[PDB]
Write a protein that binds this ligand. Structure first.
Ligand SMILES: *[B]([O])([O])[C]([C][C]([C])[C])[N]C(=O)[C]([C]C1=[C][C]=[C][C]=[C]1)[N]C(=O)C1=[C]N=[C][C]=N1
Lengths: 230, 229
C-alpha cells in the first residue's frame, strides 16, 4: 500500500521497505568477492559487459579513495560513485585537517553514516549499492562492507552479488591466516570463473585490486598478467 | 655590530666584528670598529657609522692636544668624559653606542661603557651593539673573571663568534686588540677560521623533517629528497 513508498515509514512490524527494496538492487547485481591476507586485502569483481565494443577499463567498479584505501562498489554503479566521491572527501579531510591518514575502521564508519542519512528523510532514497572498503592503515589490513541500510561490519572475507551464497562457501575453504596476497589473486579470480555462468551473458571479465606490503602499502590495480586466464 | 671589551689583570681586550650594513645589504664586510684615540686607549664603535666616526676623531684631537700640553700620559677616565660630554649634548641627533677601554699606569686596565642615552658606567666587561643581547646569557654562564691575556683573547673571539652566528646585523671578520703595558697587539681572524659557526655545528646537520613523503602512515621518516623515492 502506502507503507512502502518512502523511507520515513516504519512498517507494522518495524521494517523499512525502501531500504530492503534497495537491498534487492545489490542482490541482482554482479558478483563481488574479497579476502584479508594477513599483510593486505585483495578485492575482485566481475564486470558484465553488455556489448563487444566496450573499451578495456570501462565501468571499473574499483576506485581508489586514499593512497592506502579504496572502495569497490557492488550494486548500482552511478549510486556508488556518490559514495566514492563522499569517502574521498572524508579522507581528504583527515589529511588536510588532522595531518594523518584515515584509519580503516574510521573511513568505513563515515561511509555507513552517509548511507544511513539518506534512509531517514522523506525526500531521499537509499543507495542501491554495497560498498566494500579495503584499507591498509596504521591499524593493519581492514576489510569492511557497508550495506544500503548503513550497517558496517569488519569481515575476513565477503561475497556480494547474485551468487553470493555459492561464492561464500568457496571462501570457507581458504585460510585467511596463512593466506598471502601472492596466491589469493589466483584463488579469488578462480572463484568468479566457477561461481558465474556464461549461459546468461557472453561478455564477462574480472577486475582485481589489492593493497599490501609488496605494493608499498598503496592501493593499486593489478598488472594485467597476474590474473588467471579463465 | 657586536662590540665588547673585557678586563684582565694587565690590561683590556677589545673585540668587534667587521660589517657595516645599510639595513639589509652589506656595504662593507671589512669594517674596523676599533678606533685609536691615543696609543693605549681605544674605543669600540656601534650605531651610526658617520655619527660615531665624527665623535671619535673629535675626541682624539682634544685628547692629543691635551697630551702635548700636559707632557705626560692620558688617563682612560679622561677620554671617557669627552665621549660622555659629546654623546649627551647631541643625544637627540646622533645614534652612538661607545665602549671606551684602555690602559693607564695609574689605574691599570679600565672599561667604560657609554650607551646611546649618554651615561657613563665603569665596568669589568662591557657589551654593545645590536648583537650584544645574545651575549648576556653567554657571559652569565661561560665567563669567569680573572683570566690571563691569552685566555681573554680566545674567549672574546669565541664570544663574538656566537654573537654574529645568530645576529643578522653582525658578521665578517673578528678584530681584536689588547691594550696593556706592552705594545698593543692586534689580531684579525677570518670567518673561515672562526671558533664557532652554525654550519659546522654538528647538531644542525640533520634537516628538520618538513617535506614529508606522501605515505600511508603517520610515521615520520624524514624529508623527501628525490622525485622517485
Ligand atoms: B654596526 O652594524 O651597528 C655598525 C656600527 C658602525 C659604527 C660601524 N653600524 C652600521 O652598520 C650602520 C647601520 C646600522 C645598523 C644597526 C644599527 C645602527 C646602524 N651602517 C651605516 O650607518 C651605513 C649605511 N650605509 C652606508 C654607510 N654607513
Amino acid at each position: 500500500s502506502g507503507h512502502d513508498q518512502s523511507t520515513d515509514v516504519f512498517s507494522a512490524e518495524g521494517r523499512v521497505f525502501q531500504v530492503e527494496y534497495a537491498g534487492k538492487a545489490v542482490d541482482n547485481s554482479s558478483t563481488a568477492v574479497a579476502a584479508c591476507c594477513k599483510d593486505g586485502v585483495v578485492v575482485a569483481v566481475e564486470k558484465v559487459h553488455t556489448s563487444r565494443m566496450l573499451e578495456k577499463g570501462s565501468n571499473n567498479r574499483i576506485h581508489a579513495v586514499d593512497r592506502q584505501a579504496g572502495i569497490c562498489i557492488c550494486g548500482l554503479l552511478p549510486d556508488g560513485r556518490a559514495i566514492v566521491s563522499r569517502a574521498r572527501q572524508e579522507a581528504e579531510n583527515s589529511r588536510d585537517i588532522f595531518a594523518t591518514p584515515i584509519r580503516g575502521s574510521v573511513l568505513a564508519n563515515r561511509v555507513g553514516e552517509f548511507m544511513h542519512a539518506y534512509t531517514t528523510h522523506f525526500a531521499y532514497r537509499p543507495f542501491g549499492c554495497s560498498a566494500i572498503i579495503a584499507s591498509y592503515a596504521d591499524d593493519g589490513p581492514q576489510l569492511f562492507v557497508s550495506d544500503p541500510s548503513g550497517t558496517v561490519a569488519g569481515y575476513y572475507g565477503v561475497a556480494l552479488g547474485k551468487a553470493k551464497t555459492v561464492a561464500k562457501s568457496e571462501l570457507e575453504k581458504l585460510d585467511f591466516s596463512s593466506l598471502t596476497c601472492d596466491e589469493a589473486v589466483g584463488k579469488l579470480a578462480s572463484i568468479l570463473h566457477e561461481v558465474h555462468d556464461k549461459q546468461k551473458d557472453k561478455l564477462y571479465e574480472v577486475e582485481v585490486a589489492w593493497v599490501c606490503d609488496k605494493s608499498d602499502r598503496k592501493f593499486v590495480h593489478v598488472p594485467a598478467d597476474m590474473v588467471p586466464a579463465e | 655590530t657586536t662590540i665588547l671589551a673585557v678586563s684582565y689583570n694587565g690590561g683590556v681586550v677589545l673585540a668587534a666584528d667587521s660589517r657595516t650594513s645599510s639595513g639589509t645589504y652589506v656595504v662593507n664586510r671589512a669594517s674596523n670598529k676599533l678606533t685609536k684615540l691615543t696609543k693605549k686607549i681605544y674605543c669600540c664603535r656601534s650605531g651610526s657609522a658617520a655619527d660615531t666616526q665624527a665623535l671619535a676623531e673629535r675626541v682624539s684631537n682634544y685628547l692629543g692636544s691635551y697630551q702635548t700640553d700636559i707632557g705626560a700620559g692620558v688617563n682612560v677616565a679622561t677620554a671617557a668624559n669627552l665621549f660622555q660630554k659629546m654623546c649627551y649634548m647631541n643625544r637627540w641627533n646622533i645614534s652612538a653606542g661607545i665602549i671606551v677601554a684602555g690602559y693607564d699606569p695609574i689605574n691599570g686596565g679600565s672599561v667604560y661603557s657609554i650607551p646611546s642615552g649618554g651615561s657613563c658606567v665603569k665596568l669589568d666587561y662591557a657589551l654593545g651593539g645590536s648583537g650584544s643581547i645574545f651575549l648576556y646569557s653567554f657571559f652569565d654562564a661561560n665567563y669567569k673573571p680573572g683570566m690571563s691575556k691569552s685566555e681573554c683573547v680566545a674567549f672574546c673571539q669565541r664570544a663574538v663568534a656566537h654573537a654574529y652566528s645568530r645576529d643578522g646585523s653582525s658578521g665578517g671578520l673578528i678584530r681584536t686588540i689588547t691594550l696593556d703595558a706592552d705594545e698593543p697587539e692586534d689580531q684579525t681572524i677570518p670567518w673561515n677560521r672562526s671558533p664557532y659557526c652554525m654550519e659546522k655545528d654538528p647538531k644542525y646537520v640533520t634537516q628538520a623533517t618538513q617535506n614529508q613523503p606522501f605515505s600511508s602512515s603517520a610515521k615520520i621518516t624524514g624529508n623527501r629528497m628525490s622525485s622517485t623515492g
